[PDB]
Structure formats: C-alpha cells, structure tokens
Amino acid sequence: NPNHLSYFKFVGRIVAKAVYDNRLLECYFTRSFYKHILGKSVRYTDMESEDYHFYQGLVYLLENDVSTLGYDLTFSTEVQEFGVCEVRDLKVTEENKKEYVHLVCQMRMTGAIRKQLAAFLEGFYEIIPKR
C-alpha cells in the first residue's frame, strides 16, 4: 500500500482514542510493540518468538566463545525492508557482543517497521503524551 505509513498513523490515533475513551480494543500487540509504544528497548528473549532461529543464533553467540563461529562477524547484517535487501551497519569482540545482541535485536525488530512505527507513534503521541 503506497499510503501505508498514513494508515499506521491512523491506527496509532485510534489506539490513543480507545485509551482516551477508556474503551477496550481487541488488539493483541507484541511485547516488542508495547515496548516501542512505551519507548522501552526489547530483550533478546523477544527474538525467540519472532525469529526462533535468529534467537538461536544469538544464544549461540551467548555463553560460547566467538571462536566457535569459525568465521568472523561484525556489526552489520543483511535486512529486507520494504522488499529491498540491504547490508546495514549496526554501529565483533568479547566486549561488543553484550551490545550486539541488544543492538542487533533493535535493528531486527525496527528496521523493517521503522517508518510504520514512527507514523504510529505520531498518531498515538498526538493524543496521548509519551511521558
């Protein structure tokens, strides 16, 4: 849909309208999306439901030496957004992975939705202040 961002801003408005009216909607968003509407970072355990094998890759990164990978990685990943596939920087080491799993999960959750999300947040925060 070429106007889709505007519709995501509309549904953010409709969510804030349901909240303002104190009326319940049958929405069942992810903990990730509720965190985004609250401005909270996601956690790597959220990836388990969205992309189990990518969660499994991160869990293979945790509690294992980088030497178990047998080839190097860096803070860059291939992402399909809007049907375009692009390699995007995220900004590897024993010190960086603590942030990589956090940041890689940010990129994997938002990259494909960052503009829909910004439109939704504009619809929501138009009516319900973020704070």
Side-chain angles (χ1 to χ4, degrees):
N1 277 78
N3 52 4
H4 61 298
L5 303 179
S6 191
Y7 274 83
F8 283 108
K9 189 178 135 291
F10 182 58
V11 73
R13 161 170 289 198
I14 289 292
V15 176
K17 174 58 179 169
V19 167
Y20 193 98
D21 194 3
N22 191 0
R23 292 296 178 268
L24 302 180
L25 298 195
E26 318 323 313
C27 291
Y28 307 108
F29 297 120
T30 71
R31 291 193 298 274
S32 292
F33 189 54
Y34 288 116
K35 284 163 160 205
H36 311 330
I37 306 153
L38 295 173
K40 294 302 198 299
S41 295
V42 299
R43 200 159 186 71
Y44 81 93
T45 51
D46 294 328
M47 306 310 286
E48 188 193 276
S49 53
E50 298 308 299
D51 192 358
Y52 192 69
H53 293 301
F54 187 81
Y55 166 79
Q56 290 266 279
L58 300 171
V59 177
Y60 175 107
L61 208 167
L62 272 58
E63 81 260 350
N64 302 176
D65 302 288
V66 303
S67 316
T68 204
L69 212 171
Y71 70 96
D72 289 345
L73 287 185
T74 58
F75 273 48
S76 290
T77 325
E78 180 163 41
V79 179
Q80 184 167 218
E81 175 178 10
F82 306 173
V84 330
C85 295
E86 295 302 320
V87 299
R88 294 183 181 277
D89 46 357
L90 312 180
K91 53 152 176 53
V92 82
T93 82
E94 292 288 280
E95 293 81 16
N96 285 317
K97 63 185 180 193
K98 184 178 179 180
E99 208 190 341
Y100 174 87
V101 173
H102 185 74
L103 293 172
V104 76
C105 290
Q106 312 324 121
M107 183 50 60
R108 175 58 64 108
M109 286 304 313
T110 65
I113 73 175
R114 60 185 177 125
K115 302 202 190 77
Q116 303 96 306
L117 183 68
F120 182 94
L121 301 186
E122 188 167 31
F124 192 95
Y125 300 144
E126 260 201 346
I127 296 187
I128 301 295
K130 181 178 177 188
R131 85 183 201 292

